[PDB]
Symmetry: C3
Amino acid sequence: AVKIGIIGGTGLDDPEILEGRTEKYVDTPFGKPSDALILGKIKNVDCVLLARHGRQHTIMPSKVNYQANIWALKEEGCTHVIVTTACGSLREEIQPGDIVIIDQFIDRTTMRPQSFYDGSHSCARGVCHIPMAEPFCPKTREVLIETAKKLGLRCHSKGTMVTIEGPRFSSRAESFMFRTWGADVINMTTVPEVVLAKEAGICYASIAMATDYDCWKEHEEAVSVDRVLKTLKENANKAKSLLLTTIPQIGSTEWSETLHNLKNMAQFSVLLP
Amino acid sequence: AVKIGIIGGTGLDDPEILEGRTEKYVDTPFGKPSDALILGKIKNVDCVLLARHGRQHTIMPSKVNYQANIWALKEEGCTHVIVTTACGSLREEIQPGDIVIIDQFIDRTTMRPQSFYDGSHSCARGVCHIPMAEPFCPKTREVLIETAKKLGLRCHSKGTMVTIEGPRFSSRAESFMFRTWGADVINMTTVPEVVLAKEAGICYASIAMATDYDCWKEHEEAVSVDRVLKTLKENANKAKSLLLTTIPQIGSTEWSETLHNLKNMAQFSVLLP
Amino acid sequence: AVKIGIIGGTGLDDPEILEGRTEKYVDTPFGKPSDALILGKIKNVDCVLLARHGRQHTIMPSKVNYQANIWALKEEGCTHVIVTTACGSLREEIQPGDIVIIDQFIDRTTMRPQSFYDGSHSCARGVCHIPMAEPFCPKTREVLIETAKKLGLRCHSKGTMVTIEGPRFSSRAESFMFRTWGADVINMTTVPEVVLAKEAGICYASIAMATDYDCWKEHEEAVSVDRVLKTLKENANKAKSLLLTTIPQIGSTEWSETLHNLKNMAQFSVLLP
Ligand SMILES: CSC[C@H]1CN(Cc2c[nH]c3c(N)ncnc23)C[C@@H]1O
Ligand SMILES: CSC[C@H]1CN(Cc2c[nH]c3c(N)ncnc23)C[C@@H]1O
Ligand SMILES: CSC[C@H]1CN(Cc2c[nH]c3c(N)ncnc23)C[C@@H]1O
Ligand SMILES: [Cl-]
Ligand SMILES: [Mg+2]
Ligand SMILES: [Mg+2]
Ligand SMILES: [Mg+2]
Ligand SMILES: [Mg+2]
């Protein structure tokens, strides 16, 4: 019974990838999601699409309701969440237009709730300490990696995403610092989205698309809103094709054991009185 | 006139270490403490015990009322605060079950008030900039170190605690990063507890107990709630014995000069109009 | 039509540098500024002075209304904002009393709005991602540097400011860590002041004055409120003279192209629906 949540990021807020589309606005105990859920199918696989920033990109990264978004997808029955995220490259070999199937993060966010279990919601009682050693589902990641290869897409098989609070871009001193820390790409949205997915027992993976070299690299176009959007206009089709081709493979794979183990990890992370 | 505040952490929320126990719920200008104060004695030394997370461990690290807890202990007349804190080890030589008498911290918290002087409480007026060069009382630390030796306990005489916001555990990229920064142990509660104690002119020290190797070290059991609680079940007695044996020594030592200097540092850190 | 906003920091809250002073309390959509605007002149150049902490230094760094302060200065017609900031030195060669014309920052703040565009103010609609590759105006910085030389003042031509949340000073482990990161000076106020200035299309520069060596350097007086204020009492005249001599030079320079480019950068950083 797989059902794939898709969270569309910058330049991919509402990708025309689902057949048999039906719009459904929902509510959650953590408030309204960013926008309507878009229910549909890719081949015979049920999907639920959601614009991270709203379909008109009106919500800045700090104000995205990550709890509501993940809650809504889980409540709709999603077993997996595969997302897109635009990002800056911190490595020469990760070129604008490249995809990075990230496997780690470094949190630089400051303003964001990272748990459903805040002691104020009867829907999630207790104190939850979710493990983050392996934040992304390696089985989903492996299907994304193999599919990118079949599509002939420049794709990096791992990567560490530094997530900054924003909405400003980083200073040059910060950009260089993140490089010394071993971060490979930079964005504003991976945390706490990945964390809440893990608490929900969902297989989560991220299609990171490099759009710029932040501001560390000489003789490159400086990061700006226009530069990010231009790179996505040129390359977003690659993410769309990757989703379209990956999802049927996920639908034909066995997931019960993977999902059971995630459910157990999430369940045993909650300390009750 | 020494009086010892004891803040019990994970696996030590309400240790049966006090004789002549009396429960006392209090209020403060910063709200209610985590739980009732437990008044009692160790030998002839007055103590005040307080569960950091509540005695049923119902309060997550971000939501702990650090201001109320420290305010309540100070108002009850505590000259010292000695705490327990479970932690992950970031160093091969700090094994689960080891005690670390930490002497430094690196703040990674984001959500927490760190001062009594926020411009909104008539009980603490002015702008306070407390020094943090020596965050922990070295005289109290030295008694803990010497007592641990007398007890034959594996104990490290110093250490830098990185305090993360939580409630999630760290990613592997974060865990490795904290190691490059020179942090020795990792927790979610040292900051701002140590900071507020200093503002209150209290001699503060911390008994850190390693419960796991976070997620950096191969061929070790991964950090999880169950793994932390299991290690504490096995080793909490060591912290209990250390408190029981240390406190009488503190009670027989001269503290007026130490306390006067702390009072002065706290007093001179407040800039009034 | 240049008009110079001056934000006075610690030890320089209300410097007697303006002729023809008129006090003007204003309001903004983000609340009240720290204090009254002080309108006046230096030679024939219009200025607007504002105490960052209030003229009685009653507002701690976390509670400073950076949005209101920058909004008020922009609304009064300021083309430039030149500020003073006291700071700790993280480098042997930056001595207490030295000026540093900082050119980069590393953000360690956690509690502060960094944008006017938070989705809640009709005065600033949209999602704004301001570039921070060059956070400070290099043309203003160059005039400050050349003027400091003409005055014979010990002045460093660049520097990376780490801005901590405060109000506590850093621990020793933190102080050493910031040195490994390549930060040169440390304060509590550069972020988000510099960020909001950029969003407002204002030429912003900072006169950083070292007052101490934080707590990393042996055989120096430990940072404290008294030590900072003492160094500023001795050296604040240098910042005052630098402002007084710089501002007339700014007034006689051509700025239309510089200001146009800043306006464009700010304008194109806003994504509308
Ligand atoms: C409409 S452009 C801004 C959006 C794109 N997001 C990702 C991103 C691309 N390049 C980045 C960089 N150099 N640093 C941090 N983030 C990013 C961030 C924001 O949501
Ligand atoms: C009921 S277990 C979770 C509680 C124990 N606290 C300390 C701690 C042990 N191991 C840690 C690690 N690897 N990283 C961060 N913190 C810790 C954190 C939390 O209050
Ligand atoms: C009244 S003294 C405190 C004020 C001076 N500000 C700057 C500063 C000087 N030395 C610093 C250091 N070692 N670390 C961080 N900041 C500073 C901070 C605060 O507003
Ligand atoms: Cl950080
Ligand atoms: Mg290849
Ligand atoms: Mg030994
Ligand atoms: Mg915060
Ligand atoms: Mg010189």
